[PDB]
Design a protein around this nucleic acid. Structure first.
Lengths: 125, 51, 213, 103, 63, 94, 11, 230, 63
RNA sequence: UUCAACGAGGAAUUCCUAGUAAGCGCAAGUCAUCAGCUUGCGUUGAUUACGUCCCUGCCCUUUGUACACAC
């Protein structure tokens, strides 16, 4: 009976599942808050889906991210991709489509690796 | 400028080894090289006639 | 007057987001300290080949800038400095170390010269990158040179290379570290003070170009 | 050897000015400016260094006769340096001028 | 001595130039009509600006 | 586009709601007396409001700014916009 | 040897 | 008015190596030296002009080139000149085989010739020669070219015979206070003065008569001594 | 590529060659399409600079 | 206290263009090879070319054939 939206972010072998539901405003990564993401010089890589679009988008939803695998920087990249596409998917589903593709324009103008990972590599030259 | 003298051995040969003044490290190093080259040569010879 | 009220309640979040973090949602500043607005490139021909227009939060965009020919010309200039900093036999791959020492050297550039350290490094690029050079002419293999120009991508490339290896040599075995010698290098190259390795090397290239021009 | 560290971190010597060969006895930054540093020594000369260019001083306030031991700056006019030495004689200098002669 | 700026309008191909050195046809920016054939060292493309020390020397081949 | 709906109140306040969810998006405050007409350009770029203080306000809509403001000679009672020719007509009081 | 273009220029 | 330095006791000047590209100095290069080893059958000789009849012609080269004595007499001149004693000079010598040797100022070069030959053989074959005190190293073979070791701001001349004769004191006075001055002197017995053309922007001459390599070296050293008040 | 390599001084003396050659009407008419192809490409390529030259001699030459 | 080697390695030579070079550990031990090691596995991850045949080479064509148009 509650609205909930699950998305996935991935880098090299990291994986990050984000559950977005209608809540009080709390963002958690692996149970601890989002302000305790290590290695603390990439905390703004985690913070940029939030600050790109303002915390008033997040002030009614509460996200939680379970991250597994990879190393430090793979984990912060999977976290930020999960946060970004989770917020866009919640806005498609339970808020209006105008806000959904405004969020898509904001994240894609910053970098579209917040929404689409680079998936199949390499090249045979 | 301070003035130091250059340490060298007169009548040099770079293939020959230098003169360590000890005879209990130079001689054991000589027979180290002797034992290694003769051991490798001997067991290479016996494994090739075993083949 | 005219005012646009587009948020209608003071937003509180259940996770305490710090005050300087939620301060930064209105302008993207590098390392949450240094701005990217009013960082102009004081030399045309090196706009479009230094990239300060897209503002970032940290010098770790992992984007793919080495699969087409001129795409590296729009990697942000702090990141190009970082990537050129993390190259030797010792610290290949240690990009968090290079990001940390770029953070430290921008802090002490600002504390020694009260100005924008992003503007300082933009100025260092535009001063250091040479404008002519000599290529050894073949002519049968004979010992002669001939002076040519340099493309602006080669100017920014050789600018960042000269700055970072000047900082490596100035902190080879001295008391100072790579962050501090890179700070004095970027300050000396920014004002163009002829006492940096970078602009002494640039003046030597332009001088030999003038010689057998 | 005027060493300037950063406050609240004793491990990062920010720079080290090799001033005159005698003991430097008084060092303080400008009160209005933030990038010039006045160091006076037992050489009877105070100095205004710029902390970007810490190889040569941006002004070299000479004109004293015995053992300068005190600086001050004038709190509104930021060109005016009131130095004080062991022969009475609170000399003070406008920095726009030559600087080898107190005003 | 001043310096001048010149926007490339053609990357000259099929010249028999020395490798690494590409001949090029730049035009000036202060009078946007007069051109001069230079030869640059870096990776150059069309409509990028390059800083000529002197404006009075056309370029030959290199070999 | 059918996404936004604009309300002009009799105390001079143009509020912009979404139609799909109905949550208040924006709130322009230019007029000080009643707003008797609102309209938006066919490409959602310039909106025009007219009120009975006698000023017409031209706002950009993507950016939130106003482009200009025109003071007529009478209070205005009705606006009809024509969206292909970009011409609106204001029925004045005189 | 020259090539075309510069043979035309010198001629 | 002006006070004295706080310690008038004479301190030795710092001896300078190529790990200092800031300090003004004078660099003297002996180009086209003839330093070559030969195995003799159980002996390693430096190829002198006089220790053989035809080792050089059994290898191919000519007797009018195998000259190590002239780089010996230039090492004697540059290493007894007062500017070396004040430490405003470093020597690099380089061979006809392109083998670059950094010669420190503190080296007590052997004053006779056959000690020098026996030292130069161990230099070419050990790549490094220690001080007897051995707290530092004082003679070593290094990486080509010279411009990696030379200071960052340095105008490099060569000393030749088909060149305008200039005066050394005012020529050194024309360069400013953070520029060094590197000199390439031909240590041939005879031949062309082209041996360093990719480095040099100024080909200068010192006399109108045939000058020797050591006399030209001492001429430029004495000019720098009168110039820098030594 | 041969016509693009030459600078504008050589475009001007190429026009002088064309103006010399269309008086000798044996080798104008035995090389009309080659002359037409080369001249039309040359002024089509240097047309930004050609029209900004200001001299009546070149104007009468073109005419 | 005074009698050995060495403080990043000469001439030359080789290899290399993106998850590439290089760093780092962790497992396995697969009918040949390997343990004086070999092969996987992830983790951190760049500089510079991405153009040109000028040099060193190598290769191909020298009737347009294949049908317009153009050359």
């Amino acid at each position: 009976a509650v609205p909930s939206v699950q998305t996935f972010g991935k880098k090299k072998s990291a994986t990050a599942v984000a559950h977005v539901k209608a809540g009080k405003g709390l963002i958690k990564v692996n149970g601890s808050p989002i302000t305790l993401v290590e290695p603390e010089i990439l905390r703004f890589k985690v913070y940029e889906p939030l600050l790109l679009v303002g915390l008033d988008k997040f002030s009614n939803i509460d996200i939680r991210v379970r991250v597994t695998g990879g190393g430090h920087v793979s984990q912060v990249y999977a976290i930020r991709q999960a946060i970004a596409k989770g917020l866009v998917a919640y806005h498609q589903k339970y808020v209006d489509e105008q806000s959904k593709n405004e969020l898509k324009k904001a994240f894609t103008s910053y970098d579209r690796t917040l929404l689409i990972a680079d998936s199949r590599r390499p090249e045979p030259k | 400028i301070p003035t130091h003298a250059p340490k060298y051995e007169e009548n040099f040969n770079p293939d020959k080894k230098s003169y360590d003044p000890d005879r209990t490290r130079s001689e054991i190093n000589k027979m180290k090289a002797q034992l290694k080259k003769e051991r490798k040569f001997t067991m290479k010879e016996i494994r090739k006639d075993a083949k | 007057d005219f005012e646009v009220v587009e948020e209608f309640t003071p937003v509180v979040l259940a996770t305490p987001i710090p005050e300087e973090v939620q301060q930064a949602q209105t302008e993207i500043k590098l390392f949450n300290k240094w701005s990217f607005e009013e960082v102009e490139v004081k030399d045309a021909s090196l706009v479009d080949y230094v990239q300060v227009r897209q503002p970032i939060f940290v010098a770790h965009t992992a984007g793919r800038y080495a699969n087409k020919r001129f795409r590296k010309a729009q990697c942000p200039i702090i990141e190009r400095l970082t990537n050129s900093l993390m190259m030797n036999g010792r610290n290949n791959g240690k990009k968090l170390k290079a990001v940390r020492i770029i953070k430290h050297t921008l802090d002490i550039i600002n504390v020694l010269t009260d100005q924008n350290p992003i503007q300082v490094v933009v100025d260092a690029i535009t001063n250091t990158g040479p404008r002519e050079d000599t290529t050894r002419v073949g002519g049968g293999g004979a010992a002669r040179r001939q002076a040519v120009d340099v493309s602006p991508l080669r100017r920014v490339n050789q600018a960042i290379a000269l700055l970072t290896i000047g900082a490596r040599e100035a902190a080879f075995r001295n008391i100072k570290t790579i962050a501090e010698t890179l700070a004095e290098e970027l300050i000396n190259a920014a004002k163009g003070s002829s006492t940096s390795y970078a602009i002494k090397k640039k003046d030597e290239l332009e001088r030999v170009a003038k010689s057998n021009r | 050897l005027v060493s300037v560290y950063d406050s609240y971190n004793p491990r990062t010597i920010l720079l080290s000015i090799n001033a005159s060969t005698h003991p430097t006895h008084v060092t303080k930054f400008h009160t209005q400016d933030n990038k010039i540093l006045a160091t006076a020594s037992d050489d009877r000369v105070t100095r205004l260094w710029d902390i970007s260019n810490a190889y040569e001083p941006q002004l070299e306030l000479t004109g004293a006769t015995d053992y300068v031991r005190t600086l001050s700056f004038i709190p509104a006019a930021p060109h005016l340096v009131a130095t004080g030495s062991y022969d009475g004689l609170i000399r003070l200098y406008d920095t726009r001028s030559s600087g080898s002669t107190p005003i | 001595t001043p310096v001048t700026l010149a926007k490339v309008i053609k990357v000259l191909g099929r010249t028999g130039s020395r490798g690494g050195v590409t001949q090029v046809r730049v035009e000036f920016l202060e009078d946007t009509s007069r051109t001069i054939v230079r030869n640059v060292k870096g990776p150059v493309r069309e409509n990028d600006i390059l800083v000529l020390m002197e404006s009075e020397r056309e370029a030959r081949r290199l070999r | 586009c059918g996404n936004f709906g604009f309300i002009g109140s009799s105390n001079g306040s143009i509020t912009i709601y979404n139609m799909q969810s109905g949550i208040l998006r924006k709130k322009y405050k230019l007029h000080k007396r009643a707003v008797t007409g609102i309209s938006l350009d066919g490409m959602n770029r310039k909106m025009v409001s007219c009120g009975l203080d006698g000023i017409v306000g031209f706002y950009d809509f993507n950016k939130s700014t106003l482009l200009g403001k025109l003071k007529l000679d009478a209070p205005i009672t009705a606006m009809v916009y024509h969206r292909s020719s970009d011409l609106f007509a204001l029925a004045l009081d005189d | 040897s020259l090539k075309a273009g510069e043979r035309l220029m010198e001629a | 008015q002006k006070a004295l330095p706080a310690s008038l006791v004479p301190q030795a000047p710092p001896v300078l190596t190529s790990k200092d590209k800031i300090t003004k100095r004078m660099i003297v290069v002996l180009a086209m030296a003839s330093l070559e080893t030969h195995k003799i059958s159980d002996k390693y000789v430096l190829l002198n002009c006089d220790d053989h009849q035809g080792l050089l012609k059994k290898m191919g080269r000519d007797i009018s080139e195998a000259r190590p004595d002239i780089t010996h007499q230039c090492l004697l001149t540059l290493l007894d000149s007062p500017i070396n004693k004040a430490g405003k000079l470093q020597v690099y010598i380089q061979t006809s085989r392109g083998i670059l040797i950094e010669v420190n100022p503190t080296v007590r070069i052997p004053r006779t010739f056959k000690r020098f030959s026996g030292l130069m053989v161990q230099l070419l074959h050990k790549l490094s020669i220690r001080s007897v005190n051995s707290e530092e190293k004082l003679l070593k073979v290094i990486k080509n070219p010279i411009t990696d070791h030379l200071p960052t701001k340095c105008r490099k001349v060569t000393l030749s015979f088909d060149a305008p004769v200039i005066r050394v004191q005012d020529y050194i006075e024309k360069l400013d206070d953070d520029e060094s001055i590197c000199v390439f002197v031909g240590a041939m017995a005879r031949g062309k003065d082209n041996f360093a053309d990719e480095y040099v922007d100024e080909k200068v001459g010192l006399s109108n008569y045939p000058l020797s390599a050591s006399v030209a070296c001492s001429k430029f050293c004495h000019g720098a001594e009168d110039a820098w008040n030594i | 590529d041969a016509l693009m390599v030459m600078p504008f001084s050589y475009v001007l003396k190429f026009l002088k060659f064309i103006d010399t050659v269309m008086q000798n009407k044996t080798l104008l008419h035995s090389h009309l399409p080659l002359i037409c192809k080369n001249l039309f490409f040359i002024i089509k390529f240097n047309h930004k600079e050609l029209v900004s030259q200001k001299n009546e001699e070149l104007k009468l030459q073109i005419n």
